[PDB]
Amino acid sequence: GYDRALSIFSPDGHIFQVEYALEAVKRGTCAVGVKGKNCVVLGCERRSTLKLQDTRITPSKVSKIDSHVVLSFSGLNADSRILIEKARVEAQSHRLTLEDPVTVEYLTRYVAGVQQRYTQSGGVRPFGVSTLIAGFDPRDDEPKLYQTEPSGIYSSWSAQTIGRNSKTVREFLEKNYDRKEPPATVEECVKLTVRSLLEVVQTGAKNIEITVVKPDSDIVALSSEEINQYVTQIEQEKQEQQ
Amino acid sequence: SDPSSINGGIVVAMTGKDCVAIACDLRLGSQSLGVSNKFEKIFHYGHVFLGITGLATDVTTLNEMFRYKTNLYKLKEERAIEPETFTQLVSSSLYERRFGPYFVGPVVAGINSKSGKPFIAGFDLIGCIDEAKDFIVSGTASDQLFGMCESLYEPNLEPEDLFETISQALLNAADRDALSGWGAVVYIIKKDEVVKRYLKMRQD
């Protein structure tokens, strides 16, 4: 058939294809994730080099696995679609067999597993995208945010960012989050996400996209005005004087 | 149960002068109990009309196969299929499904729109090609229907006169059946206008 190798083990220890995959994540989109006690918000900045698009017939950067599970990405569109397709089959499959929608943890294992597998066989090389997988388990209300990377590794994080200019916004999270208090106010969780993307997008407050997931199939895209309102508020904070 | 006579159905086609006509019942039954007064057993893709009688599950699966075949062919050639070409397409599809367990009686009707001929052609359970242009009948009551067409039909008729023939011929053959009541339709086709006349007829 064909099965000649494309994965070749590095004398580094970190395979060539994994290391070149991660580069693909930095070029791509920017995605950030903040958890509440009651929410998990996934923010994305839109970069349109020229815009003659609409925002309603473009594919949006937060993609539904389920009515109450989302997957968000940085990297190439192309790769991420493949990861999505496989996950929508897996969503349904657990639903068919256990009589219950997915746990988030199993799904995360799954997206990792396909990536990990393409590192391990010949004839396939692994995908150029890192993802934020979030959602809610059956009978539950506590948010789950996991981060998966092309090495096939995953781990849980209370706040994370991936994609372009990750460094700046990570630091920004280190000084603007509390571990004795994830905010239980939906408004301050959106607020932090808007501050983070503001500092990078350059212009435009409708080139900011929030997607909020609350329990029980509540996935909601907040509208233009609501977003403007946090941006007003951030310039009042920045032009504060006593 | 029965192989094709669960829901019944009968189909008649006739030739005239720059017209043909194709007619069908609307029965669907479940054994000898008539269930429905609507069920359309004639479909068309553009100016080719295909009636297939017999078991409904089998008429439906075929209808979707020929729709597929014609659509994709239409798309490539940038024009519709011809009566003559479609008869070829049918023979072969049916000869592929002889080995499978289908139970069908197709009849092909249309007017050629650039060769200027009325065209009708027939098909069976075996799926053999029948070249004749006078009348072709198919269905449950095909035996009664040939007896009737062969006396009642007279060659070369204007649309009005083709209507009087087809209608009565069907109506009287149908009246000796219970598997061919529950309403009926007649279609009179020219290649630039189609008239649909519903008939009022017997049921059980």
Partner: protein
């Protein structure tokens, strides 16, 4: 069998589906299901083998909900019905066919019209104002044609359906201790808890 009736009234689709499984003298269970919610605006009834029921249902549900999430619009009752028919139209040609005959009640909410599709295990799909499977129809089409004429309320339909079931339990020796009835409408799917004349 399991006797499954349908009526499409002007507002709604009402499906009547058995509320008991009778073994001899006594009801071994009288809480038994004969219908499965395919979607928020799609409901599907079944009769045939009890185990052919669940398998078929859970497959059809899983395929349609994958489509629904993927395409970002729940499928229309006409798409879903064609879809189901097609699946039946394979299995009939194979060694084991599914042997459950269904009544699919859907409300097209995007345009706002009720629809009923009656699909046999053969894979024969037909639209009607009313229907039945089995021996049933021989008594109850005579009640229906006579005493019912389209465009009557949902409430008149519940009383019609009761007359059907009463005749069926009496004159036919079939026992199934009536039906639990459900409405598929613009408001979605509700179980009518009453059966005292409904």
């Amino acid at each position: 069998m399991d006797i499954i009736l349908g009526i499409r009234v002007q507002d709604s689709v009402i499906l009547a589906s058995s509320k008991a499984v009778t073994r001899g003298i006594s009801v071994l269970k009288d809480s038994d299901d004969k219908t499965r919610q395919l979607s928020p605006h799609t409901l599907m009834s079944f009769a045939g083998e009890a185990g052919d029921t669940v398998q078929f249902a859970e497959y059809i549900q899983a395929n349609i909900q994958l489509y629904s999430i993927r395409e970002d619009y729940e499928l229309s009752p006409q798409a879903v019905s064609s879809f189901v028919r097609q699946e039946l139209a394979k299995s009939i040609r194979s060694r084991r066919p599914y042997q459950v005959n269904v009544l699919i009640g859907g409300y097209d909410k995007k345009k706002n019209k009720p629809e009923l599709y009656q699909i046999d295990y053969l894979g024969t799909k037909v639209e009607l104002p009313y229907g039945a499977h089995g021996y049933s129809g021989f008594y109850t089409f005579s009640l229906l044609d006579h005493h019912y004429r389209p465009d009557m309320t949902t409430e008149e339909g519940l009383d019609l359906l009761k007359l059907c079931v009463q005749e069926l339990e009496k004159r036919m020796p079939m026992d199934f201790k009536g039906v639990i009835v459900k409405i598929v409408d613009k408001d979605g799917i509700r179980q009518v808890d009453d059966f005292q004349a409904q």
